[PDB]
Amino acid sequence: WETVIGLEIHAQLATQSKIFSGSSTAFGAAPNTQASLVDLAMPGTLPVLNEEAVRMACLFGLAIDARIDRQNVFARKNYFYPDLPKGYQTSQMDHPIVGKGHLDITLEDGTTKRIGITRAHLEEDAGKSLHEDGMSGIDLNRAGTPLLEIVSEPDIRSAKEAVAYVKAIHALVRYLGICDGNMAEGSLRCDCNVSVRPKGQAEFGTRAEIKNVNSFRFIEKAINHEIQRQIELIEDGGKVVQETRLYDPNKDETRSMRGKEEANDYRYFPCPDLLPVVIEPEYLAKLREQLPELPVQKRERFESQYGLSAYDASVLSASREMADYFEKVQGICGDAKLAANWVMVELGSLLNKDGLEIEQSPVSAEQLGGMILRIKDNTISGKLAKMVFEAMANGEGSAXXXXXXXXXXXXXXXXXXXXXXXXXXXXXXXXXXXXXXXXXXXXXXXXXXXXXXXXX
Amino acid sequence: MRSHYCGQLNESLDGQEVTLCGWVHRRRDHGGVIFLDVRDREGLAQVVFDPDRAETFAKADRVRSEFVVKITGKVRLRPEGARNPNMASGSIEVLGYELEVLNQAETPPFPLDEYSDVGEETRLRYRFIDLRRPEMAAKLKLRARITSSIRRYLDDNGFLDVETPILGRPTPEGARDYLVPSRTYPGHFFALPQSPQLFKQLLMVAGFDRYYQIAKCFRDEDLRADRQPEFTQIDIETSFLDESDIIGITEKMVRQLFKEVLDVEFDEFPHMPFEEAMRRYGSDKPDLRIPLELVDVADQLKEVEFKVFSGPANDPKGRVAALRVPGAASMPRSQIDDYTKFVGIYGAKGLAYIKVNERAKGVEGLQSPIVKFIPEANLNVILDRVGAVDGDIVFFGADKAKIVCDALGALRIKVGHDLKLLTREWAPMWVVDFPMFEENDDGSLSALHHPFTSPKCTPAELEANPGAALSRAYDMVLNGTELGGGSIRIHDKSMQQAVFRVLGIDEAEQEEKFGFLLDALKYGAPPHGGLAFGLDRLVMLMTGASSIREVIAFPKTQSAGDVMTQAPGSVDGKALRELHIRLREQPKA
RNA sequence: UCCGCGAUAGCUCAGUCGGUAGAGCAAAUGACUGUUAAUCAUUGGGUCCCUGGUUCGAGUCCAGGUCGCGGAGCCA
């Protein structure tokens, strides 16, 4: 069996004003408060394309290494639904913003596979229907919100690969600063065009378009449970029909919302209100200079030049802020493995305490840089790390013995707790080093050997 | 050879020697005196050992927990300062003449009686030592007493205990059937019955005048708390009887049962119509322990400035009902907010209220933010109608009929229990006169129960206006819970065709869905009617148990599996092949 | 996807600003003549949910998983 799937991802761009309207984007519980005259599709009103919208569009186009057309025209997707005000969705039929690109997705089975993206054009969002009294309520607060429809080439195969692609898209978009990426608030959505086929015969099972898929887990489970379903369907023969299916995480079953009786004729044609936007090579010349370093290539840059493991490189390159924050400390000259080490474990705990969106807030790189500076040059490595670790990070912002004296401390400890009796069996002798370490803080490496020699 | 039961040692048997066998609950060693608590089906008793026969002492020191032993001794009357209230036999002891260890016992996973912190999964996994606990045993024995009483009554009244087959034919519409792959008929399945309904009807056709059966029932639905996949039901069906006779016999049964077992008496069961029940309680299963009642008041609040009242007041598809809670004006705003959020869960947009403090001053005598939009006269006749006086609070539910009925009905029961406003006696009832039809979301008409339910009117008044038709159906309610219910069936040709015509079902579906039934109905079916009780819940009520699993010997969890026998389990591929079926747990990349 | 809580002896459950898994109950041995959910002393027992990583050292800190309860979100 060979399962050929596809992915249609809608990404909500983080722009202040809407794509054609002047209303804000992020909204609260207040309904119809984020809707001017343009969004309500009043008769005689006209739309004007947003600047940072197309900017971010061709930005994603440049990041994904796709052949961007010099000209792109907005077309109309005429369909009737209460959420859609003007009766047509302003999309792009011919000549999209970006087309034919490739994204390197990193999985766990060795090779980081290359996936195709056929296009990524600019769309617009519609209203939302809610559960209420009777009739129903439509809110146009999200209507008019700029959307980026990243359509992937059907080169993507297994479900795990699909999850990898969604995560790669999410990561790239997070790095570019185009969308929030937070699927919980409803910014990033996707659909899956899954179709299976028996290897050998050019005949195959009917296409299944699973719409409205939230989490990555939901993606994997739904895609699997759809693949196996199609496998059964073709094995039995029966009736292979093209349908619009849905997935609920509660029962892990796939239900059909609408049966596709025929190809929906949306009647596409160039919008007479919107003139074709011309993207000249100068825009791309400046924006490519503005292009940030890709995460997929950032972890690999963490593999090549800086001594690091795949794991630590990936988890360090999980975000741009953390990456830059770490690279500064490396710039201090703190040992790569050890500087990164300090970034991971120690400050990571306090970062887990508040989980502060940006690591620009809690601790500066110059401070930890100064700590490692004190640990390397000014002082030797060992116990000096342990206390400053406690004191320096939380509160104050201000920046070692190796004698024989510890032996004199080693006797009194044995007198404190009844340690003389516990010496009989080997077990663990950490409790012996505890009292000495607490009394001194000094020099653990010597203390372990001395305590081990003194025990039995 | 046992002489007497441990938990049946009264004070009267003093000066008699006894031999009793049982388990060793707990053992107390004082050195000079050894105490053993021996337990059987009837309860616990204390046996005492003094080393004056040190051989028995040797057979006393080795004994540990849950050892199965046989002890013969003499019952000695214990001192006044040693008497035990917890032990039913706890005013006497038995000095052990001779002991014998019938069988040894490994350490029981969990302890008996509280506050031994067993958790439900562990208690279910070792259910065979859990039922040793006297409380569980008392519950099950009580169940046995119940089935005993019911069987005695039904037998004495000319009912026939006849068994109906479990493996029957599968059919949709009603509920998911448990299927059983057929070894002899490949591709075909048997099905576990949801109720012996069809079979009992056939038994009426078969000439058996009166039938009853305590039958096993199976539903493959996702389950609720207090709901199990395998549940026992008391099926009853009779011929040549109307609704009055059936309700008579059944009511008599319930009374006789409650007097035989718990020794309580029920007077008479009030017959309340569905319409009335919905009117003053907003529920098809009223809790008659709570005297609090819903009173409709929307008619006088039609042309009023306040709009959340006037809205549904002029809308026929709903009402505005009030609920007086007495002496509850001292209630804090916290509780009010909690209750508003509570009624929120049943769909009510808001819970309006009036705190009634001083009636002679009018409007300045009613502290509330709503009082301004409503005239003084209407207010006064409302207060007059609801029965409210000084010190009370009046709540208001104003919405679609279903929503207000459910939300205020539940607010009613909730605030009913929370303020302890009920009489603690038993309160039984009958719910009668249901409607025949209802709309089915999309439209059209449909029967709530079954299309075989007898309407109170004629097939003409029926084909006239189907909405005005009441059914001859009946449910029995105790403490606001539905013990069971049934109805008298239709055996009339023209009537069956009348309800068939009125529901939109042509003869295709008539034949495909009910053909064998209609066939059996055509060859001379008598006037028959029946009812069924959920025996489990009945025992649950009669015991006072919290859950239904407490009145079932070996229950299953909410996900239909039982943790003790680890069922359902895996079966080898051979038995899978012989039954003509395949699995589909195949490896994916 | 997200928030809170939780996984640690037979059972229940605690464990700080990182140093031999404790306590009640149960079990084993011993003591005690009135307990009755006995007590007291002593002994025995366990993979701190899985993997990887951090540190002189991990139940504890970092990252990624599994499972139970409830809440939020989505359901063009």
mmCIF file with all atom_site columns, N, CA, C and O in Angstrom, chain A residues 56-79:
data_model
loop_
_atom_site.group_PDB
_atom_site.id
_atom_site.type_symbol
_atom_site.label_atom_id
_atom_site.label_alt_id
_atom_site.label_comp_id
_atom_site.label_asym_id
_atom_site.label_entity_id
_atom_site.label_seq_id
_atom_site.pdbx_PDB_ins_code
_atom_site.Cartn_x
_atom_site.Cartn_y
_atom_site.Cartn_z
_atom_site.occupancy
_atom_site.B_iso_or_equiv
_atom_site.pdbx_formal_charge
_atom_site.auth_seq_id
_atom_site.auth_comp_id
_atom_site.auth_asym_id
_atom_site.auth_atom_id
_atom_site.pdbx_PDB_model_num
ATOM 1  N N  . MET A 1 56 ? 4.485   40.404 3.823   1.00 0.00 ? 56 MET A N  1
ATOM 2  C CA . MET A 1 56 ? 4.667   39.133 4.515   1.00 0.00 ? 56 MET A CA 1
ATOM 3  C C  . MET A 1 56 ? 4.434   37.955 3.575   1.00 0.00 ? 56 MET A C  1
ATOM 4  O O  . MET A 1 56 ? 5.043   36.894 3.731   1.00 0.00 ? 56 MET A O  1
ATOM 5  N N  . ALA A 1 57 ? 3.549   38.150 2.602   1.00 0.00 ? 57 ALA A N  1
ATOM 6  C CA . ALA A 1 57 ? 3.268   37.118 1.611   1.00 0.00 ? 57 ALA A CA 1
ATOM 7  C C  . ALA A 1 57 ? 4.523   36.784 0.810   1.00 0.00 ? 57 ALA A C  1
ATOM 8  O O  . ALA A 1 57 ? 4.975   35.634 0.796   1.00 0.00 ? 57 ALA A O  1
ATOM 9  N N  . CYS A 1 58 ? 5.096   37.791 0.157   1.00 0.00 ? 58 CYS A N  1
ATOM 10 C CA . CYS A 1 58 ? 6.298   37.572 -0.640  1.00 0.00 ? 58 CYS A CA 1
ATOM 11 C C  . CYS A 1 58 ? 7.501   37.278 0.254   1.00 0.00 ? 58 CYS A C  1
ATOM 12 O O  . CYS A 1 58 ? 8.515   36.753 -0.209  1.00 0.00 ? 58 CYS A O  1
ATOM 13 N N  . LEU A 1 59 ? 7.385   37.618 1.536   1.00 0.00 ? 59 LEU A N  1
ATOM 14 C CA . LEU A 1 59 ? 8.397   37.244 2.518   1.00 0.00 ? 59 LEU A CA 1
ATOM 15 C C  . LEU A 1 59 ? 8.417   35.730 2.701   1.00 0.00 ? 59 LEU A C  1
ATOM 16 O O  . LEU A 1 59 ? 9.475   35.097 2.634   1.00 0.00 ? 59 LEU A O  1
ATOM 17 N N  . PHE A 1 60 ? 7.238   35.155 2.927   1.00 0.00 ? 60 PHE A N  1
ATOM 18 C CA . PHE A 1 60 ? 7.103   33.706 3.021   1.00 0.00 ? 60 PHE A CA 1
ATOM 19 C C  . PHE A 1 60 ? 7.499   33.055 1.703   1.00 0.00 ? 60 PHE A C  1
ATOM 20 O O  . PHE A 1 60 ? 8.064   31.961 1.685   1.00 0.00 ? 60 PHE A O  1
ATOM 21 N N  . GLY A 1 61 ? 7.195   33.736 0.602   1.00 0.00 ? 61 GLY A N  1
ATOM 22 C CA . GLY A 1 61 ? 7.571   33.257 -0.714  1.00 0.00 ? 61 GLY A CA 1
ATOM 23 C C  . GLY A 1 61 ? 9.076   33.164 -0.881  1.00 0.00 ? 61 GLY A C  1
ATOM 24 O O  . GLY A 1 61 ? 9.586   32.218 -1.483  1.00 0.00 ? 61 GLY A O  1
ATOM 25 N N  . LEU A 1 62 ? 9.789   34.148 -0.343  1.00 0.00 ? 62 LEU A N  1
ATOM 26 C CA . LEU A 1 62 ? 11.246  34.165 -0.409  1.00 0.00 ? 62 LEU A CA 1
ATOM 27 C C  . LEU A 1 62 ? 11.864  33.146 0.541   1.00 0.00 ? 62 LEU A C  1
ATOM 28 O O  . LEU A 1 62 ? 12.892  32.542 0.231   1.00 0.00 ? 62 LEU A O  1
ATOM 29 N N  . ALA A 1 63 ? 11.236  32.959 1.697   1.00 0.00 ? 63 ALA A N  1
ATOM 30 C CA . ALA A 1 63 ? 11.737  32.011 2.687   1.00 0.00 ? 63 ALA A CA 1
ATOM 31 C C  . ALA A 1 63 ? 11.595  30.568 2.210   1.00 0.00 ? 63 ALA A C  1
ATOM 32 O O  . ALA A 1 63 ? 12.409  29.709 2.549   1.00 0.00 ? 63 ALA A O  1
ATOM 33 N N  . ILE A 1 64 ? 10.557  30.308 1.422   1.00 0.00 ? 64 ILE A N  1
ATOM 34 C CA . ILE A 1 64 ? 10.252  28.952 0.980   1.00 0.00 ? 64 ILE A CA 1
ATOM 35 C C  . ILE A 1 64 ? 10.940  28.618 -0.349  1.00 0.00 ? 64 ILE A C  1
ATOM 36 O O  . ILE A 1 64 ? 10.781  27.518 -0.882  1.00 0.00 ? 64 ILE A O  1
ATOM 37 N N  . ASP A 1 65 ? 11.713  29.572 -0.866  1.00 0.00 ? 65 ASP A N  1
ATOM 38 C CA . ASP A 1 65 ? 12.462  29.395 -2.113  1.00 0.00 ? 65 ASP A CA 1
ATOM 39 C C  . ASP A 1 65 ? 11.545  29.050 -3.283  1.00 0.00 ? 65 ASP A C  1
ATOM 40 O O  . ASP A 1 65 ? 11.760  28.059 -3.980  1.00 0.00 ? 65 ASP A O  1
ATOM 41 N N  . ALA A 1 66 ? 10.524  29.873 -3.494  1.00 0.00 ? 66 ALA A N  1
ATOM 42 C CA . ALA A 1 66 ? 9.561   29.634 -4.562  1.00 0.00 ? 66 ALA A CA 1
ATOM 43 C C  . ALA A 1 66 ? 9.638   30.700 -5.645  1.00 0.00 ? 66 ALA A C  1
ATOM 44 O O  . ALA A 1 66 ? 9.927   31.863 -5.364  1.00 0.00 ? 66 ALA A O  1
ATOM 45 N N  . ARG A 1 67 ? 9.379   30.296 -6.884  1.00 0.00 ? 67 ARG A N  1
ATOM 46 C CA . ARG A 1 67 ? 9.351   31.235 -7.995  1.00 0.00 ? 67 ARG A CA 1
ATOM 47 C C  . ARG A 1 67 ? 8.147   32.160 -7.863  1.00 0.00 ? 67 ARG A C  1
ATOM 48 O O  . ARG A 1 67 ? 7.011   31.767 -8.133  1.00 0.00 ? 67 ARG A O  1
ATOM 49 N N  . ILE A 1 68 ? 8.409   33.391 -7.440  1.00 0.00 ? 68 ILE A N  1
ATOM 50 C CA . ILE A 1 68 ? 7.360   34.384 -7.263  1.00 0.00 ? 68 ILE A CA 1
ATOM 51 C C  . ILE A 1 68 ? 7.036   35.074 -8.581  1.00 0.00 ? 68 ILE A C  1
ATOM 52 O O  . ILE A 1 68 ? 7.932   35.556 -9.274  1.00 0.00 ? 68 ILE A O  1
ATOM 53 N N  . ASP A 1 69 ? 5.753   35.117 -8.926  1.00 0.00 ? 69 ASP A N  1
ATOM 54 C CA . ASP A 1 69 ? 5.324   35.771 -10.153 1.00 0.00 ? 69 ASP A CA 1
ATOM 55 C C  . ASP A 1 69 ? 5.519   37.274 -10.032 1.00 0.00 ? 69 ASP A C  1
ATOM 56 O O  . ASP A 1 69 ? 5.427   37.835 -8.939  1.00 0.00 ? 69 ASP A O  1
ATOM 57 N N  . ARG A 1 70 ? 5.793   37.926 -11.156 1.00 0.00 ? 70 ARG A N  1
ATOM 58 C CA . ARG A 1 70 ? 5.987   39.368 -11.166 1.00 0.00 ? 70 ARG A CA 1
ATOM 59 C C  . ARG A 1 70 ? 4.654   40.058 -10.919 1.00 0.00 ? 70 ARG A C  1
ATOM 60 O O  . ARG A 1 70 ? 4.594   41.123 -10.304 1.00 0.00 ? 70 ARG A O  1
ATOM 61 N N  . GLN A 1 71 ? 3.584   39.435 -11.402 1.00 0.00 ? 71 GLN A N  1
ATOM 62 C CA . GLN A 1 71 ? 2.236   39.961 -11.231 1.00 0.00 ? 71 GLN A CA 1
ATOM 63 C C  . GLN A 1 71 ? 1.293   38.903 -10.671 1.00 0.00 ? 71 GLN A C  1
ATOM 64 O O  . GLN A 1 71 ? 1.371   37.730 -11.039 1.00 0.00 ? 71 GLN A O  1
ATOM 65 N N  . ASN A 1 72 ? 0.406   39.325 -9.777  1.00 0.00 ? 72 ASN A N  1
ATOM 66 C CA . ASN A 1 72 ? -0.607  38.434 -9.224  1.00 0.00 ? 72 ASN A CA 1
ATOM 67 C C  . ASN A 1 72 ? -1.958  39.134 -9.142  1.00 0.00 ? 72 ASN A C  1
ATOM 68 O O  . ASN A 1 72 ? -2.048  40.279 -8.701  1.00 0.00 ? 72 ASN A O  1
ATOM 69 N N  . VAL A 1 73 ? -3.008  38.442 -9.575  1.00 0.00 ? 73 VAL A N  1
ATOM 70 C CA . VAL A 1 73 ? -4.343  39.026 -9.623  1.00 0.00 ? 73 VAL A CA 1
ATOM 71 C C  . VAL A 1 73 ? -5.306  38.320 -8.678  1.00 0.00 ? 73 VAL A C  1
ATOM 72 O O  . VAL A 1 73 ? -5.353  37.091 -8.628  1.00 0.00 ? 73 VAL A O  1
ATOM 73 N N  . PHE A 1 74 ? -6.074  39.104 -7.930  1.00 0.00 ? 74 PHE A N  1
ATOM 74 C CA . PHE A 1 74 ? -7.094  38.554 -7.046  1.00 0.00 ? 74 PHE A CA 1
ATOM 75 C C  . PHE A 1 74 ? -8.352  38.188 -7.824  1.00 0.00 ? 74 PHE A C  1
ATOM 76 O O  . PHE A 1 74 ? -8.856  38.983 -8.617  1.00 0.00 ? 74 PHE A O  1
ATOM 77 N N  . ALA A 1 75 ? -8.851  36.978 -7.595  1.00 0.00 ? 75 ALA A N  1
ATOM 78 C CA . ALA A 1 75 ? -10.074 36.516 -8.240  1.00 0.00 ? 75 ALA A CA 1
ATOM 79 C C  . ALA A 1 75 ? -11.190 36.355 -7.215  1.00 0.00 ? 75 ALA A C  1
ATOM 80 O O  . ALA A 1 75 ? -10.953 36.427 -6.008  1.00 0.00 ? 75 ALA A O  1
ATOM 81 N N  . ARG A 1 76 ? -12.406 36.130 -7.702  1.00 0.00 ? 76 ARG A N  1
ATOM 82 C CA . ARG A 1 76 ? -13.565 36.010 -6.827  1.00 0.00 ? 76 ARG A CA 1
ATOM 83 C C  . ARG A 1 76 ? -14.063 34.571 -6.732  1.00 0.00 ? 76 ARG A C  1
ATOM 84 O O  . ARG A 1 76 ? -14.228 33.889 -7.745  1.00 0.00 ? 76 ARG A O  1
ATOM 85 N N  . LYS A 1 77 ? -14.298 34.118 -5.506  1.00 0.00 ? 77 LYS A N  1
ATOM 86 C CA . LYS A 1 77 ? -14.826 32.781 -5.264  1.00 0.00 ? 77 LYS A CA 1
ATOM 87 C C  . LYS A 1 77 ? -16.289 32.886 -4.843  1.00 0.00 ? 77 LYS A C  1
ATOM 88 O O  . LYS A 1 77 ? -16.605 32.871 -3.654  1.00 0.00 ? 77 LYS A O  1
ATOM 89 N N  . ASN A 1 78 ? -17.176 33.008 -5.828  1.00 0.00 ? 78 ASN A N  1
ATOM 90 C CA . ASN A 1 78 ? -18.593 33.252 -5.573  1.00 0.00 ? 78 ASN A CA 1
ATOM 91 C C  . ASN A 1 78 ? -19.333 32.068 -4.956  1.00 0.00 ? 78 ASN A C  1
ATOM 92 O O  . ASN A 1 78 ? -19.613 31.077 -5.630  1.00 0.00 ? 78 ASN A O  1
ATOM 93 N N  . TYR A 1 79 ? -19.650 32.180 -3.669  1.00 0.00 ? 79 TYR A N  1
ATOM 94 C CA . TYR A 1 79 ? -20.515 31.211 -3.008  1.00 0.00 ? 79 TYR A CA 1
ATOM 95 C C  . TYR A 1 79 ? -21.365 31.906 -1.949  1.00 0.00 ? 79 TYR A C  1
ATOM 96 O O  . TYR A 1 79 ? -20.947 32.905 -1.364  1.00 0.00 ? 79 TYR A O  1
#
